[PDB]
């Protein structure tokens, strides 16, 4: 297995959409049929609902290559079917050290409130147990990349799991692949994920922030575009070096700003550069969920990094793969079934 692989922390499951907060418009709770009318009225956080950390594997492995998952499963009825599906798919689970006391597929959410329903975790899912000791030895030994749907950051100890893996990141040579795509609580504000998580927000390498997760995650209002407003170009941002200057970090090769399948910036030690993109899924409105942007986009950069491992800080080597990723991500969005909707 020569290809630097991508460890996959967070949790282990399928079909887990992240951030939830007010979209462009609302939809009704009367007769639904296909209630996903917000495949064309979301707010870019759901204008690209991706997939989990193990579903990304199928997106790349379809073309071919070597991708795997690290973490644990439940054990019981939900946990053993976890073993069926994650082994029906194309990922690795040979490094499992499950617990045997919680309930699988159930976070369990008793109470911790002064009233009604303000409640927090108790003993989470039987698969959500990764700690400083439950850490796998392998992780960053046959790998140089690492995906994180940052759901591991609402969890207090899933953090220290990965930062004790920073010493696993530097025991051998490796790098992290944080595809941020922040779920609901990390999608909150600037100070929320600048200091409260501290470590993931500034220690990463081939990272994947999004402009929205730099928009509220920095200048809440003044940095509205920088070029746009001239002929007919959508107001995304002109986010570049001076707008990552708050939050860059070192010991990397090249990081990637995602912003969904929209404007993407790459970051080298010689040259920044900038690319663009779009959000798109109307073709037949009854055949879509605008799904697996996190899957399709991320896999594409991984694919090119594998076939041509001489990427490095090359203008054209990365700029195409970004453009390839931009076209890859939108394609997987509007496919009927994700299972067939993984690039082949």
């Amino acid at each position: 297995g020569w290809p630097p692989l991508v460890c996959c922390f967070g949790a282990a499951q399928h079909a887990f959409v992240p951030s939830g907060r007010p979209a462009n418009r609302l939809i009704d709770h009367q007769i639904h049929e296909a209630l996903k009318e917000a495949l064309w009225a979301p707010d870019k956080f759901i204008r690209a609902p991706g997939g989990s950390a193990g579903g990304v594997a199928i997106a790349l492995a379809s073309l071919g290559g070597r991708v795997a998952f690290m973490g644990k499963l439940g054990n019981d009825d939900y946990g053993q079917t976890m073993l069926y599906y994650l082994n029906v798919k194309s990922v690795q689970t040979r490094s499992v050290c499950v617990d045997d006391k919680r309930w699988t597929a159930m976070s369990q959410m008793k109470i911790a409130k002064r009233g009604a329903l303000r409640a927090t975790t108790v003993k989470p899912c039987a698969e959500d147990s990764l700690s400083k000791s439950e850490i796998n030895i392998d992780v960053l030994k046959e790998a140089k990349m690492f995906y994180l749907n940052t759901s591991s950051l609402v969890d207090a100890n899933m953090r220290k799991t990965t930062m004790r893996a920073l010493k696993i990141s530097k025991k051998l040579g490796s790098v992290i692949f944080y595809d941020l795509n922040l779920p609901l609580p990390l999608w909150k504000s600037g100070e929320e994920t600048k200091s409260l998580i501290q470590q993931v927000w500034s220690l990463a390498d081939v990272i994947e922030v999004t402009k929205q997760e730099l928009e509220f995650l920095c200048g809440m209002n003044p940095p509205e575009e920088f070029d746009t407003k001239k002929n007919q170009r959508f107001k995304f941002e002109h986010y570049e070096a001076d707008i990552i200057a708050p939050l860059w970090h070192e010991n990397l090769k090249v990081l990637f700003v995602t912003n969904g399948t929209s404007k993407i910036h790459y970051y080298t030690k010689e040259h920044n550069g900038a690319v663009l993109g779009v959000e798109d899924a109307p073709m037949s409105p009854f055949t879509q969920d605008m799904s697996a942007s996190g899957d399709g986009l991320v896999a594409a950069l991984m694919r090119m990094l594998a076939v041509q491992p001489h990427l490095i800080t090359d203008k054209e080597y990365l700029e195409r793969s970004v453009k390839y990723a931009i076209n890859c991500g939108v394609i997987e969005q509007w496919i009927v079934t994700r299972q067939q909707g993984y690039p082949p």
Partner: protein
């Protein structure tokens, strides 16, 4: 390394209410791409976009199509022919109903139509009927959204329900050109597009729908089997 693909609109004239024109440009396209894009876009624009129109007209106290009415200068067949050119807008698949109930010596135009909530007319002066004497004129109409030219049977007689073989043509004309860029050794080319629509849609929207219908069509192959 050299330039990035750019496309823009360079001209847009509104010749009339129901006639719009738009020219577009693409930028550094390498060889072979321009011809494929141009021919695919022309075919899609000519035969993929859908536009709603009136399909069946029902009249009261009229024997047949080729009949005359007192107080009206226009024969019934003339009224059907004039009614086929009314242009409408909608975005929901399905037939709807409409009516027109007007008094006598007025002069009836396209603004006298009564429409469902999601359907609107674009021109508001298209002549549809001329009236001279006071007679109460009531006509019912059916609206449909299909693709391409469709021909219907004369069934569903009632007193009279004349079906007009409405043409579902929102794009009046399409043209394109593939120029040269002179990029030294590398051979690039500049592609110009040109779309004339009838006001049901507009350029940069007919182009959008035409691109999306094509990317519909090309899609099954991406899935395995």
């Amino acid at each position: 390394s050299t330039q990035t693909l750019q496309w823009k609109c360079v001209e847009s004239r509104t010749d009339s209410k129901c006639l719009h024109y738009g020219r577009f440009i693409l930028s550094p396209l390498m060889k072979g791409q321009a011809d494929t894009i141009g021919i695919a876009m022309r075919r899609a624009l000519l035969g993929e976009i859908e536009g709603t129109c009136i399909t069946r007209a029902k009249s009261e106290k009229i024997p047949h199509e080729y009949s005359t009415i007192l107080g009206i200068q226009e024969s019934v067949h003339e009224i059907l022919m004039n009614l086929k050119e009314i242009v409408l807008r909608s975005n929901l698949y399905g037939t709807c109903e409409a009516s027109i109930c007007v008094r006598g010596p007025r002069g009836v135009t396209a603004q006298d139509i009564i429409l469902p909530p999601y359907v609107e007319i674009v021109d508001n002066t298209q002549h549809i009927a001329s009236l001279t004497e006071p007679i109460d004129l009531c006509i019912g109409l059916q609206l449909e959204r299909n693709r391409g030219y469709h021909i219907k049977a004369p069934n569903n007689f009632q007193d009279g329900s004349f079906p007009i073989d409405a043409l579902f043509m929102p794009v009046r004309n399409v043209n394109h050109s593939i120029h040269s860029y002179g990029n030294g050794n590398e051979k690039q080319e500049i592609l110009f597009l040109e779309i004339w629509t009838n006001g049901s849609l507009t350029p940069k929207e007919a182009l959008y729908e035409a691109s999306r219908n094509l990317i519909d069509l090309l899609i099954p192959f991406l899935h395995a089997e």
